[PDB]
Amino acid sequence: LVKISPQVSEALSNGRAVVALESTIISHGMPYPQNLQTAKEVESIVRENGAIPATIAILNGVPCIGLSEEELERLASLGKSVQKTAGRDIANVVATRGNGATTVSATLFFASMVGIQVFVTGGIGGVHRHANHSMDISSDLTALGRTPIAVISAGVASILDIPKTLEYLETQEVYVAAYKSDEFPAFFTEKSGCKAPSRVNSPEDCARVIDANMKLNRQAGILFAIPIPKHHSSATQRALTEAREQNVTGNAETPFLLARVNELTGGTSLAANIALVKNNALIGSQIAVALSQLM
Amino acid sequence: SLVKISPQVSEALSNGRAVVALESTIISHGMPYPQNLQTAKEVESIVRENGAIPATIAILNGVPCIGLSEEELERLASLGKSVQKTAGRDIANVVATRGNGATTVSATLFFASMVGIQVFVTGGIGGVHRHANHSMDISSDLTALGRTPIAVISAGVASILDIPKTLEYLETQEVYVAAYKSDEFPAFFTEKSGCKAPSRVNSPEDCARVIDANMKLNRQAGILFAIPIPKHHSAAGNLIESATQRALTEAREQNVTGNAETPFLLARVNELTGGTSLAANIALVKNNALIGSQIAVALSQLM
Amino acid sequence: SLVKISPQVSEALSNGRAVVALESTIISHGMPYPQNLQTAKEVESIVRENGAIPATIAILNGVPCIGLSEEELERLASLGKSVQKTAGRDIANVVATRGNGATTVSATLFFASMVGIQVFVTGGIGGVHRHANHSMDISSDLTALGRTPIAVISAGVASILDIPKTLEYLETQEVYVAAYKSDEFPAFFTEKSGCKAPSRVNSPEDCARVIDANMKLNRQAGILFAIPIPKHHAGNLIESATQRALTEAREQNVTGNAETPFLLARVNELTGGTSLAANIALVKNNALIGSQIAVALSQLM
Ligand SMILES: [Mn+2]
Numbered sequence: 088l089v090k091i092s093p094q095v096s097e098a099l100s101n102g103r104a105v106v107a108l109e110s111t112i113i114s115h116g117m118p119y120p121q122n123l124q125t126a127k128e129v130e131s132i133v134r135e136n137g138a139i140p141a142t143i144a145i146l147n148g149v150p151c152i153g154l155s156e157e158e159l160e161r162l163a164s165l166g167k168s169v170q171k172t173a174g175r176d177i178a179n180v181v182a183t184r185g186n187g188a189t190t191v192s193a194t195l196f197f198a199s200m201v202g203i204q205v206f207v208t209g210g211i212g213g214v215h216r217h218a219n220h221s222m223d224i225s226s227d228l229t230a231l232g233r234t235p236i237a238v239i240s241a242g243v244a245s246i247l248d249i250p251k252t253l254e255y256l257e258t259q260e261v262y263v264a265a266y267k268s269d270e271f272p273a274f275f276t277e278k279s280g281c282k283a284p285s286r287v288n289s290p291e292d293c294a295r296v297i298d299a300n301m302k303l304n305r306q307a308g309i310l311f312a313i314p315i316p317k318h319h320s321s322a323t324q325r326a327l328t329e330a331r332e333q334n335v336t337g338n339a340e341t342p343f344l345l346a347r348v349n350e351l352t353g354g355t356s357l358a359a360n361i362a363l364v365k366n367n368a369l370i371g372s373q374i375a376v377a378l379s380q381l382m
Numbered sequence: 383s384l385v386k387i388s389p390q391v392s393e394a395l396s397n398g399r400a401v402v403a404l405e406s407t408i409i410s411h412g413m414p415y416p417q418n419l420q421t422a423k424e425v426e427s428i429v430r431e432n433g434a435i436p437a438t439i440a441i442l443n444g445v446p447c448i449g450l451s452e453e454e455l456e457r458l459a460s461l462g463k464s465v466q467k468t469a470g471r472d473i474a475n476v477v478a479t480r481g482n483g484a485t486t487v488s489a490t491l492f493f494a495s496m497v498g499i500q501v502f503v504t505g506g507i508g509g510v511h512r513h514a515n516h517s518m519d520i521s522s523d524l525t526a527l528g529r530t531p532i533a534v535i536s537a538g539v540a541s542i543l544d545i546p547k548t549l550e551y552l553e554t555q556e557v558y559v560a561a562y563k564s565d566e567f568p569a570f571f572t573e574k575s576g577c578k579a580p581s582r583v584n585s586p587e588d589c590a591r592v593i594d595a596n597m598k599l600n601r602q603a604g605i606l607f608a609i610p611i612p613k614h615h616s617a618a619g620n621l622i623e624s625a626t627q628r629a630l631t632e633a634r635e636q637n638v639t640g641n642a643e644t645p646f647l648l649a650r651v652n653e654l655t656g657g658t659s660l661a662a663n664i665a666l667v668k669n670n671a672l673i674g675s676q677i678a679v680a681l682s683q684l685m
Numbered sequence: 686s687l688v689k690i691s692p693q694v695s696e697a698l699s700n701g702r703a704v705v706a707l708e709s710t711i712i713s714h715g716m717p718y719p720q721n722l723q724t725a726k727e728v729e730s731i732v733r734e735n736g737a738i739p740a741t742i743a744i745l746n747g748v749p750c751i752g753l754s755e756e757e758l759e760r761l762a763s764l765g766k767s768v769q770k771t772a773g774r775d776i777a778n779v780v781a782t783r784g785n786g787a788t789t790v791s792a793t794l795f796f797a798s799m800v801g802i803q804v805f806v807t808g809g810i811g812g813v814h815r816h817a818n819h820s821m822d823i824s825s826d827l828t829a830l831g832r833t834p835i836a837v838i839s840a841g842v843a844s845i846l847d848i849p850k851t852l853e854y855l856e857t858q859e860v861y862v863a864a865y866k867s868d869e870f871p872a873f874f875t876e877k878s879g880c881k882a883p884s885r886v887n888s889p890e891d892c893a894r895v896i897d898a899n900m901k902l903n904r905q906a907g908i909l910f911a912i913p914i915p916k917h918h919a920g921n922l923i924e925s926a927t928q929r930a931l932t933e934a935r936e937q938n939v940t941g942n943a944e945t946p947f948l949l950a951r952v953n954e955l956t957g958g959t960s961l962a963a964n965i966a967l968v969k970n971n972a973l974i975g976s977q978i979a980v981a982l983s984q985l986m
C-alpha cells in the first residue's frame with residue numbers, strides 16, 4: 088500500500104543514511120511556490136550532507152515515502168487546500184483517495200514503518216496555552232512517546248505552552264535534549280526561559296543516544312532540540328489575544344496564529360522558520376550519517 | 383486459550399464473515415431489569431437481521447466468553463449490580479477470583495481485538511468527566527481505544543461527561559473520530575452536543591473503507607464512529623439534557639462519588655424523565671446495532 | 686551483550702526460581718549513605734529469606750546491570766546523590782555516555798520486563814504532583830506501568846504527591862490497583878490516605894493469581910499492589926510535616942530537579958528522622974510481601 092521512492096528504497100536496502108521529512112510544512116507553513124523552494128532546499132541540504140531525503144505525504148490516497156519532483160510540486164501547488172493529516176487521519180485520507188500533508192504524528196508512523204530513524208521537522212506540536220481549560224494537547228507528543236524515532240526540531244514555539252509541553256513529553260517517556268546549550272530553544276528564538284532536561288553536543292553524541300535506544304528496543308522516541316543559529320534568530324502575545332477576542336478555534340486557530348505572527352513581524356518569523364528547518368536538516372543529516380556509520 | 387469463543391462466533395470468524403462485538407456492562411449495570419435483558423436480546427437480533435453474527439462478551443465464573451447463550455444474558459441481567467463492572471484493568475482480577483464480570487468498553491475492546499473482531503457496537507463511550515481539571519477523572523475507554531485497533535460504533539458521548547474535553551483527549555490519543563451523516567458530534571441521548579465533528583462519514587461502506595485502510599496500515603490506534611440518535615427521538619433531547627443538569631447538581635450537593643456516581647446519575651436521569659432517557663438509550667443502541675452490523679458486513683465484503 | 690546479569694540472578698532465571706526486581710534510586714537518592722547501603726542489604730536479605738532472588742537494577746559505567754554484587758551496591762551507595770537519577774527516558778543517554786545511573790520505577794520496569802521478571806519491589810511510586818492542574822507534572826512511572834506488564838509492589842503513594850489524582854491517572858492508564866489486606870489506599874509513610882482502595886487482595890497467593898491471569902491474558906498494562914506500612918511502624922507527624930514542606934517549596938519556588946529531593950529532605954528534617962525511619966520500614970515490608978508474591982507466582986507457574 089505504501090509507495091517508497093526509488094532513491095529511498097535503494098538507501099534503505101543498503102543501510103545508507105535516510106532523513107524523513109514531513110509535508111505539513113509544505114502545505115501550511117508558506118504559500119506556493121515558496122513552499123516548494125524551501126522543501127527542495129531542505130532536500131538538497133540533506134543530500135549534500137551525505138543522506139537521502141524521504142519527504143512523506145499522501146497523494147491520491149497513496150502514502151508516499153520519498154517524493155519525486157512532480158510529487159513535490161503537485162503537493163506544493165495545492166497549497167493550504169491539502170488536508171492537514173495527523174496520524175489519526177491517515178486511514179481516512181487513504182480511504183477517500185485524498186491528498187494529505189502529514190504532521191509529525193503521521194510522519195512518525197510512516198518513518199518508523201520502514202525503518203527510518205531520523206526525522207527532521209521545524210517544531211513539534213505541543214500543549215496549547217490554557218490547556219487546563221481545554222485539554223488541547225498535540226498527538227505529536229503522544230506519538231513520539233510510543234514511536235522509537237529521533238525527531239530533530241528547533242524546540243517549541245511560544246505560541247504553545249513550552250513548560251507544559253516539556254512536562255507532557257516527560258510523562259510520555261520521551262528523551263528531550265538541547266543541542267550545545269543548557270536552554271531549551273523556542274523555535275523562532277533561542278530563549279524559551281526553560282532549562283533543557285538534557286544536553287547533547289555533537290551529531291555523534293546524538294547518534295550514540297539513538298544507537299543505544301535502538302539496541303535496547305525502547306518503544307519511546309527522542310526529541311532533539313537544535314537552537315536556531317544566532318545569526319538567524321510581543322507578536323505572539325498580541326496574536327494570542329486577538330485570537331481569543333475574535334474567537335478563532337478548531338482548525339482555524341493554529342494557522343491564524345502563525346500567519347498573524349508572520350504579518351506582525353513582517354515576514355521575520357517565517358524567515359526564521361525557513362532558517363531553522365534548514366539548520367535542522369543540516370544537523371539531522373549529520374546525525375543520520377553518524378548513526379549509519381555506527382550501525 | 384483462556385478465552386471461550388462460542389461455536390457460532392468461531393464459525394463466523396474462521397470463514398471471514400461479519401461479526402459484531404457487544405459489551406455486557408450495559409446489561410448488568412447500565413439498564414434496569416428486565417429491559418436490560420430484553421434490549422440485549424433485541425440488539426443481537428438486529429445484528430443477525432442485517433447479516434452479522436453478534437458476539438456479546440463477558441466473564442463468567444472466571445472464563446472470558448466471546449458469544450453468550452440466552453441463559454448467560456439472563457444471568458448477567460438478573461444478577462445485576464452484583465456482577466463486577468469490569469474495565470480492562472479488572473479482567474485479571476475477575477478471572478483470578480473466578481467471578482462474573484460485565485465488561486465495559488475498555489475491557490470489551492481488549493477481547494474483541496484479541497480474537498480478530500473489527501467492529502464493536504456500544505451505546506456510548508466513557509469520557510473526560512466534568513471538572514476533570516480538579517479530579518483528572520478520565521475514562522480508560524479513551525486510552526484503550528488509542529492503543530487498540532478496532533472500530534467502536536457509538537452514539538457519541540453523554541453530556542454527563544465533558545464532551546469538548548473528551549474530543550480533545552481522543553485526538554491526543556490518536557483516535558480517529560467521525561460523525562455519521564452529520565457535521566455535529568452527537569451526545570448519546572441527543573444529537574446536539576454543540577461540538578463540530580472532527581470528521582464525517584456518510585455510509586456503512588465509507589466506514590468500512592476507513593477500517594480497511596486502518597487494518598492494512600497496521601495502525602495500533604482505533605476508531606470512534608458516532609451515530610446520532612434517530613430524529614424520532616429528537617423531541618426528548620431537551621428534557622434529558624435538563625434532567626442531566628439537575629442530576630449532576632444533585633450528585634454534587636449529596637457528595638455522591640466513586641463507584642456510586644455514574645449509577646446514581648443514570649438512575650436519577652431516568653427517574654426525572656419518567657423513563658424517557660432509558661427509552662432513548664434503548665433506541666440508540668438498537669440504531670447503533672443496525673448501522674454497526676451494516677459496517678461489519680461491508681467490511682467483510684471488502685476483505 | 687545488552688545487559689550484565691549477575692550470576693545469582695542468571696542462575697535463578699534459568700532454573701525458574703522466583704526473582705524480585707529492585708530499583709536503585711532509593712539507594713543513591715532516596716536515602717543517605719550509609720543508611721542507604723544498610724537498607725539495600727537488608728532488603729536483599731529479606732527477599733532471599735522468603736525464597737526469592739533479589740535483582741537490584743542500575744546502570745554502571747554505561748552497562749545496565751540486572752542483579753548487583755556487594756561491590757556494586759557499595760559503589761551506588763557511596764557515590765550517593767552524585768549518580769544520575771535515571772528515568773526510563775534517560776537510559777539511552779546514560780548508556781551512550783558510559784555513565785552511572787540509579788534507576789527509578791519507570792527505568793527499572795523496562796529492564797525487569799526485558800528479562801522476564803514479574804515482580805518489582807519499590808518503596809513508593811512517583812505520581813501526579815500537587816497543582817498538576819497548573820503544571821501537568823505527572824510521573825512517567827505511571828505511564829510506564831500502564832504499558833509494561835509487571836507487578837509493582839509499593840506502599841502506596843506519598844502525600845507529597847496528589848494521591849486522588851494519582852489513583853485517577855492510574856485508572857486512566859488501565860493499571861490494576863489493589864491494597865493489601867485493607868480497604869484504604871495507603872500513603873507510603875502512613876497507612877491513612879483518606880482514599881478508598883479501588884480493589885483489595887488479601888494474601889500473597891491472591892496477588893500471584895491476579896498476576897498469573899494478567900500474564901496468561903497477555904495484557905500490556907501492569908499492576909500496582911499497595912502494601913500498607915505495618916501499623917507498629919508517627920504517621921500523624923509525617924503528614925503534618927508534609928503539609929509544611931509543601932508550603933515551603935511553594936513559597937521558595939523550588940522546581941525542576943530540585944523539587945522532589947527538597948520535599949523528601951525537608952520532611953525528614955522536620956520530623957527528626959521519623960520519615961526516613963518509616964521509609965526504611967516500608968521498603969523492608971514491601972520486600973517481605975513482594976518476595977512471598979513472587980514465590981507463590983513461581984509455584985503457580
Ligand atoms: Mn490540538
Ligand SMILES: [Mn+2]
Nearest residue numbers: 519520521856
Ligand atoms: Mn472514572
Ligand SMILES: [Mn+2]
Nearest residue numbers: 257822823824
Ligand atoms: Mn515530574
